[PDB]
Design a protein around this ligand. Structure first.
Ligand SMILES: [Mn+2]
Length: 173
């Protein structure tokens, strides 16, 4: 089965340079691990606003993770995670941008959990949401509870940390 996976990465001011760099590295690693498969990728940076760094069509055209994230500039503003999730649900998974109608829609959200906005993400209900916690404050399962609201259910199976990203194991099959 085909899969359209979007990386939604936190680019807020709370991210230290080394941490933001770790996020970019993680995205590159995930893409190289799923190269030449039925997976197609898109990447969206979010802080106060939302920016599609590359879409599905760009991936098909260029393929190279290094060249795809080359123009990325750390936003360094707020953390509007809910607005970001909504932006992806309506502005990214579009046929005009290379999205396949039949493909399973997957979202890999990379953030430290703290959102500066609120609201509902019903427009993203049909998207499978995996949440990858950044930083050294998600060492325990209890601390990961703060990420539950953004993930698909059961939350315990769609939430993990940047270091190991064990919750993504099924994607690599
Ligand atoms: Mn932040």
């Amino acid at each position: 089965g085909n899969v359209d996976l979007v990386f939604l990465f936190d680019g807020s001011m709370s991210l230290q340079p080394d941490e933001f760099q770790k996020i970019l590295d993680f995205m590159k690693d995930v893409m190289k691990k799923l190269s030449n498969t039925s997976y197609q990728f898109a990447a969206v940076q979010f802080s106060t606003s939302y920016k599609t760094e590359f879409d599905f069509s760009d991936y098909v055209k260029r393929k190279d993770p290094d060249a795809l994230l080359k123009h990325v500039k750390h936003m360094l503003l707020l953390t509007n995670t809910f607005g970001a999730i909504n932006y992806v649900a309506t502005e990214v998974f579009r046929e005009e941008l290379g999205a396949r109608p039949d493909a399973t829609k997957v979202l890999i959200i990379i953030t430290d959990g703290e959102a500066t906005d609120s609201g509902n993400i019903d427009a993203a209900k049909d998207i499978i949401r995996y949440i990858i916690g950044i930083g050294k404050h998600f060492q325990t399962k209890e601390s990961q509870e703060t990420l539950h609201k953004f993930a698909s259910k059961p939350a315990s199976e769609f939430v993990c940390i940047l270091d190991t990203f064990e919750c993504l194991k099924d994607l690599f099959t």
